[PDB]
């Protein structure tokens, strides 16, 4: 094809790469903040389950 043909597709793909990288960074920060709630939840579930371990038997 032509240089004119190639340049447009290169531009589009570079913009796509930019957008994908930005979304990857955002998801990384979201995952980091998401694990905290699981950390907070574990003690509650364990403390209820240990009471169940004798109440429900």
């Amino acid at each position: 094809a032509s240089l004119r043909d190639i340049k447009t597709r290169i531009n589009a793909t570079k913009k796509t790469s930019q957008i994908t990288k930005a979304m990857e960074m955002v998801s990384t920060s979201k995952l980091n903040r998401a694990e905290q709630n699981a950390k907070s939840f574990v003690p509650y579930m364990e403390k209820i389950q240990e009471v169940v371990a004798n109440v429900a038997l």
């Binding site: 094809a1 032509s2 004119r4 043909d5």
Partner: protein, 125 residues
């Protein structure tokens, strides 16, 4: 004092014919083997379209030259020369053509330096 519309179908083919004549007459060529005075030729042709003043009768002539490119290369020599002369350009694109958009005016690239002054008030609104 009348108004005339003139359409030139292939300035590219006219330029090809003039290039052939120049090379047969053995004049030195420029880039893409075209003679150096092709721009003079086309400018002398096109700049004869004008809107005359009221003292001259008020007649006018508008021109619509056509230029054909190969695989969308608008940086070529004849397209650049013709673009640098005319007041505006309209680009028709095959990718728009086959996706259903006919006519294929690409509004993003098309330019008109005489916009607004050439439209009625309702259209301008």
């Amino acid at each position: 004092g009348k108004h005339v519309l003139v359409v030139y179908d292939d300035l590219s083919k006219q330029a090809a014919a003039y290039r052939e004549l120049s090379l047969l007459l053995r004049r030195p060529p420029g880039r893409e083997a075209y003679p150096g005075d092709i721009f003079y030729l086309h400018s002398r042709l096109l700049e004869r379209a004008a809107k005359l003043s009221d003292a001259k009768g008020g007649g006018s002539l508008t021109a619509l030259p056509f230029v054909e490119t190969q695989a969308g290369d608008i940086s070529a020599y004849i397209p650049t020369n013709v673009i640098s002369i005319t007041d505006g350009q309209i680009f028709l694109q095959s990718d728009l053509f086959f996706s259903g958009v006919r006519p294929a005016i690409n509004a993003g690239l098309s330019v008109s330096r005489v916009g607004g002054a050439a439209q009625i008030k309702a259209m301008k609104k």
